[PDB]
């Protein structure tokens with residue numbers, strides 16, 4: 001395993017998106033993971049439809065559109081549905097709509113997904129390096145998270161009580177302090193150009209390694 005990894009360098013991460021008034025962070029976290037796999041298997045990088053998950057991966061999957069969801073059930077939907085549209089053909093309107101999936105504009109498919117063991121940052125590291133970007137949940141209820149702008153984020157009062165779905169696109173160390181490179185979905189005005197570096201190997205800080213998962217085409 002390399003001392004550091006940044007899947008952006010490998011051209012496997014689309015542009016940071018802005019979820020707006022719709023709390024579909026789970027939707028963005030899920031598509032982000034698939035996008036990296038689509039690129040890794042077709043040399044083509046395309047933003048996948050988050051709206052597609054918000055309108056179609058609903059009750060049967062335990063998801064509530066703009067009111068919250070699960071990355072794993074989002075993957076199962078893509079498998080059951082055998083496809084998901086691209087952002088271009090099924091744009092993000094930031095609100096729940098009637099499912100408008102159209103296989104004519106399918107951009108990717110999913111074969112299965114894997115959930116990693118709870119709290120194991122060493123397994124997450126091995127996955128991020130060898131498999132690609134991993135979808136994880138983090139405790140982002142503290143203001144210190146919102147006010148973030150630079151450096152390795154460390155919040156003493158963080159817990160493993162996750163509530164926000166995001167994407168781990170790499171890891172490394174900045175001045176001795178280890179970190180996870182996390183892509184957020186609050187626009188480019190958050191942290192450093194939409195990303196945030198979170199403390200690594202600090203006892204599953206903010207529960208970043210609590211519920212990791214990634215898709216496989």
Ligand SMILES: *[C@H](CS(=O)(=O)c1ccccc1)[C@H](CCc1ccccc1)NC(=O)[C@H](CCS(=O)(=O)c1ccccc1)NC(=O)N1CCOCC1
Nearest residue numbers: 023025026066067068069070136137138162163164165211
């Ligand atoms: C996205 C997070 S957000 O940007 O912090 C946000 C804060 C406030 C309002 C909107 C978004 C999203 C927010 C849900 C929400 C909550 C309250 C009001 C409106 C919207 N969070 C979720 O969708 C999470 C994602 C799953 S997780 O990463 O927390 C996780 C937990 C357990 C195992 C694995 C991963 N899920 C939910 O919030 N819910 C609630 C509804 O039922 C489905 C799951």
